[PDB]
Nucleic acid binder design. Sequence first.
RNA 1: GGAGGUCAACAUCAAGAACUGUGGGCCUUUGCCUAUAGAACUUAUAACGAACAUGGUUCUUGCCUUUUACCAGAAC
RNA 2: GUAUGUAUUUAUUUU
Lengths: 49, 68, 49, 157, 38, 48, 23, 150, 261
Amino acid sequence: NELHPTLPTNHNKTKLLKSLKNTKYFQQTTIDWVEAGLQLCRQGHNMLN
Amino acid sequence: LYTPKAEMPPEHLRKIINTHSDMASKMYNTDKKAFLGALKYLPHAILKLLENMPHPWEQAKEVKVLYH
Amino acid sequence: PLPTKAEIQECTARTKSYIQRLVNAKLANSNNRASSRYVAPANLLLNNS
Amino acid sequence: MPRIKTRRSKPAPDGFEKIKPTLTDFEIQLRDAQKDKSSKLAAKSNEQLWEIMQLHHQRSRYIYTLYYKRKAISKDLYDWLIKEKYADKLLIAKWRKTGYEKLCCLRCIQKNETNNGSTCICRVPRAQLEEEARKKGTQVSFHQCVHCGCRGCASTD
Amino acid sequence: SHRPQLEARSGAKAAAYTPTGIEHARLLPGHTTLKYRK
Amino acid sequence: DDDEPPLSYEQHIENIEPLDPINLPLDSQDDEYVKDWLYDSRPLEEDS
Amino acid sequence: FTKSELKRRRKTRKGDGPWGSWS
Amino acid sequence: NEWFITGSNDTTMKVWDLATGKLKTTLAGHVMTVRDVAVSDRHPYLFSVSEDKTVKCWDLEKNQIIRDYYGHLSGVRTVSIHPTLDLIATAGRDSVIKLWDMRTRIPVITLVGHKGPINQVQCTPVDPQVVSSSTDATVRLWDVVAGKTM
Amino acid sequence: MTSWRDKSAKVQVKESELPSSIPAQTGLTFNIWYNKWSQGFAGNTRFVSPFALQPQLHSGKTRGDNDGQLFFCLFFAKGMCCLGPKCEYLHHIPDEEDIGKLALRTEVLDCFGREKFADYREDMGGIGSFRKKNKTLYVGGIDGALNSKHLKPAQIESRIRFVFSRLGDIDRIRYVESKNCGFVKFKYQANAEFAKEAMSNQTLLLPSDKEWDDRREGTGLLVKWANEDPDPAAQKRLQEELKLESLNMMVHLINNNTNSA
RNA sequence: GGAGGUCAACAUCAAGAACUGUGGGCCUUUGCCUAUAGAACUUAUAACGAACAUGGUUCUUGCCUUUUACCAGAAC
RNA sequence: GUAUGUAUUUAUUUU
Ligand SMILES: [Zn+2]
Ligand SMILES: [Zn+2]
Ligand SMILES: [Zn+2]
Ligand SMILES: [Zn+2]
């Protein structure tokens, strides 16, 4: 890992979320972890179906 | 301009999923397409989920989710 | 006459601009979230009425 | 922070009990309106949301009027509540600001979300949409702000 | 029915088509900037 | 098992209460400085 | 318009503020 | 003026030495025979193209391959390097004359054209900018920006 | 006036009672994306409505009226709309005047707010075609009387006339005994469409007669657009109609034209 | 006005051991010489991260029916 | 031992 560096990508400066979170369609709120574990289970499920 | 985001109750989230869970109708043929879209973004979410693990000592962790 | 100097810097101009508008398009079509880094009132309708 | 009671969470302040029932009646009803009542009609499902937002709105108006308006609890009760996510710091920080005193929500002020412009018709006072009802003559065609169900959110109405 | 080809597909028959939107692999930006001679 | 669609959060889990974690005895003598905050979720969201 | 006119006028809406239905 | 660059039908490309006649180097690296070579003026590049349907940029500074341009339906009989704009022009048995943009490898423009294989493409600095001749026995003269035969 | 223009319109069905979604059992498993059933083949599903509208009884004043919408609620045109006066899309029979309003736009789209296609459909299907006006309906599978044959085909006639009659204006009704169809024709393309989307899949006679109890298992009468009419008579008639109409509109073109001189 | 924000936008971050502005002289704007002011962040067992992944082309190998998928080194 | 292909019109389109 140290014999071949990278020195990353200036201008990565737009993270996914920042670019994404700005839109009308997302909302921000707070919540218990395991819960979000579960919603992501229903999610990943209904998607693949 | 740029007001910040507007945080919203946790219910609005749980109601949402607790509805769109059942989909048979016509009225979801937008959301249905919507789903396939996020299938590209999912792996991200896993990562952004799975580095938040509560760790041995914490009892219950609270995070900030950004939901569709 | 060989096509001068004060000329070739015109054909060069109208092309080069026109191309950069082509490429700017075809990148900004597609689906690299990371391609964006590499790049009007316009309506009088009828009379503008 | 966490709504859940757990051991990290600094145990209750004192006068809590005197309000505790009023709180719990909102609380049951959230568990009531998250209960997945199906409907075939989009107009409904959006209504469904309009409940959870309504309740949430009342709880915050309640804690709010207690602490600021009549000053019926003590700063450490209040601040413990707010720390526990019982009510919005933010929203109440709007109800402290001048005009907003009756405001809906935190969407209904958003400038950046809306297509153009701003500020759902949710905000406009009736006394003007009545004016377009006068000149144009359609009466006034608005009923529920798509986010909420506000009607006459602005503090005159 | 094996026939030796006599031809090739004119680029035009392609050219009229509408695009796709699939993104292949080798097109990921690389060698992103050129080099010039003195 | 696979027959068992995962049970939603609002109903089953939110009433159950946590059933305590590791932590560790520590001390009131050795660790006195650190025993206060060391186990917070995030140790200090606030210390001025 | 006038303050008195508005204050009197609002109570017309069915349910306080602001979800109270005009008409 | 020190060096050839020499296509070949064993698919190599050897670079000979103009003065002495000795052999400088071998640039190999094609599957099928190389029909064509062009050498940049302004850039230290070498665009060599063969019949496997590939325009393979080169870089001389290290003697290595860089960019595979791509998109012909079939083998490519002519390259030439637009002199002042930094654009490759290519074409071949598809009977279309493509303008490859150089750095991002987009076939920016696809020039329509003849009824047959395109034997030679010539790029010129001012108007009509691409001049091309085809085994249907004509020579088109092209105006790229408008997009069609002038 | 006193009928529709007077009292506010009413609910028909309580959203509770509203029909079951997920069409039921042609096959094994239920596909989620589309709503269908999966595998096997049985005879196609179609069935009479449990419902129908009640032309003067339920129609009334609604919200789109107070706020001025245009297209007519189709789940009203089935009398199935559960929103009562709340419904934006209008509840009632088209008068002539509303068509006074839509008729600006009825070139492209229906009275229900849907966008007419061009080419009709293999069968002359359900939504219009903007290349053409057609006011004239094929009506077929009249066996949605169930099979009781009513002692005269003029009882068919009385019955079709009796039903479709209600909706508004009418030109004519030609039954055909040779082949079972009615061919009916109206004034306004508006009205035409409206009757159509209303009267699919129905059964017949009195609040009860004969098999009325079981009326609900019938197939229901297909209502679909009509093609041309091969006889000479009607045809000459048609080119007449168009003729007189051009004859009128020339007056328009000389009005605006002549003014522009 | 002060404190904060798991807020945003816009600049800048790998190089002659390296930045910028300005005064003066010369050539004819660049450029050279001289004087002067200011330099956050990051660098010497060299670097934004006392952390650690993936992809593409090109060669060398290794499994070895062929391709995805691969074995382990290098260059870009 | 198989891929592969073909047809599967029920609900009357005006004389
Ligand atoms: Zn609101
Ligand atoms: Zn609002
Ligand atoms: Zn409001
Ligand atoms: Zn309705």
